[PDB]
Symmetry: C2
Subunit: 324 residues, 2 copies
Amino acid sequence: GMADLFSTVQEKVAGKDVKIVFPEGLDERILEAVSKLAGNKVLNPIVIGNENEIQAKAKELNLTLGGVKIYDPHTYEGMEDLVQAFVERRKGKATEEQARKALLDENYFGTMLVYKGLADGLVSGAAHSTADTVRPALQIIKTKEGVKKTSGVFIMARGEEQYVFADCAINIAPDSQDLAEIAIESANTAKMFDIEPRVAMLSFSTKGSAKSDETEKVADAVKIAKEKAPELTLDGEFQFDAAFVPSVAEKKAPDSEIKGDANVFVFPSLEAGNIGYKIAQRLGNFEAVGPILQGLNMPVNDLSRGCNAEDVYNLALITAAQAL
Amino acid sequence: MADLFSTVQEKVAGKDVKIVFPEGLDERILEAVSKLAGNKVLNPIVIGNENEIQAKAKELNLTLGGVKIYDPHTYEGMEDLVQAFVERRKGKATEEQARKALLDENYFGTMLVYKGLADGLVSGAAHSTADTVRPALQIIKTKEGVKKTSGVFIMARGEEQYVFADCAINIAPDSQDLAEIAIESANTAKMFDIEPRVAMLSFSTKGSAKSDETEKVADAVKIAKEKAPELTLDGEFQFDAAFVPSVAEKKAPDSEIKGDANVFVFPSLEAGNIGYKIAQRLGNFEAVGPILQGLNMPVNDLSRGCNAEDVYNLALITAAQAL
């Protein structure tokens, strides 16, 4: 179901020697995933932490660290160069002593590595707050060309059915400019899973039903998006009905690009987005793939604390894909 | 879900409850009204021109058995209704204004419900949801300690039965509103024989994220719990924590709700509307249309382009609210 969706991603990744950093080097979820990722030669994992400590941990887990490189921030050669690169990136917001201290942190150390090409993407989260990962991601690595913010999408899958849900994790109260962006970026992220983008901007009314600030926010969001990205198939201010079921599409709003065949649903607020994917998961019995960030210069992703060893493996597959 | 209605029809049938249907020339209502009277479930009152309705029912192969017809241009108590309206409008309406206002199906029918000539109204099949709720709030009003109405939905799939908090009326509810939506929704759940277990939803569980949005709800929980002690409801849950027990003891134990909520209060209209719909179209749950709550007398809004049976069930629900 969701599983063959990953085999499609692993297809694209495997054999390209993509390097992904895993800052939580002592976490068995990461060690197991890393150990196996290297074993099958899918990608080249880099782990951060004390080499002896990790080596011994891997052993009590009956693991081996085959094609796995280990970097210790208290040993790395290029630290001084990294320290210097960081201060330059922080534009004076960081002294040298600050930089040095900052980079002794797993997540920061690993983010700098991805920033300076020593790694292609980072994957942390199994033992940190979601902020502790996205923070450096935004201070060091930044958002792409015309992107101002990151968003968290979720791949929803149930059998043949595959959808993308727009920012159900990062941005709390997105505005018109934000939504339009969430929609454009989510549409591109869906390309990575070989989905043909058909965006629908959700709200509690369809193209006019109710007229309040909240509906106009999204309506405006559609203008912005359509203007900024003409070719992308997306119409806006739909209720889930109109966006998901065709009968309702021609009734509530015909003449619209979307004909009840939306496969990318942009939610109006984090409250809708979060409760949304969760209701779809627990009630609709859809498989839900955890937050996937988007719009950054280099791939960075947040695993769920208390996640799964296979969850670590797949995020890596997705993160590597974003890099390719 | 269908058996959920038989539970309501159980309570209603035989009590001679009178419900007004302002849209007298709508076949959805005529078919529903014709059938309700046919089974002697409730006593339907229809508004409009008698010859005109009588003739329309004829082209639908319907009879208007136990169905009373009121015409605003003929009703004998108009004068008294007009006067009662001006009094209720506390001077906001002149006499000429009231007279005109009451020639309107919805207003006329609302007045009947207000003066006891009917027990509840059911409109919406051919008017905006605003056009129904307007007079309901101008004439009839909210109960004792209620300030606003809320639109709940009954969600049903097989054995599963839940209530969804205001997915239709209030756009941007605040702490006081949410607490209310919760107490009222919980009561409305009693009507369907559901044992209330409210969960105030958000994007974080008892602390996860701290922003205005989470506090708004957290505050809502205080208000509600203080205002209504005995009601089992804990707050600021993510759908996980509220629906699946495994997630309850992890994200937040010691809480009254143990992943067994059956009344879900949404933080905003964007969340609630998108919510019940995703639950319906994706979760394959049966969703009964907006059911208003908290008013002095039952009033409900059908969806334009609804179903004849939809009208029939909304009447069952509205009659129940009157009992």
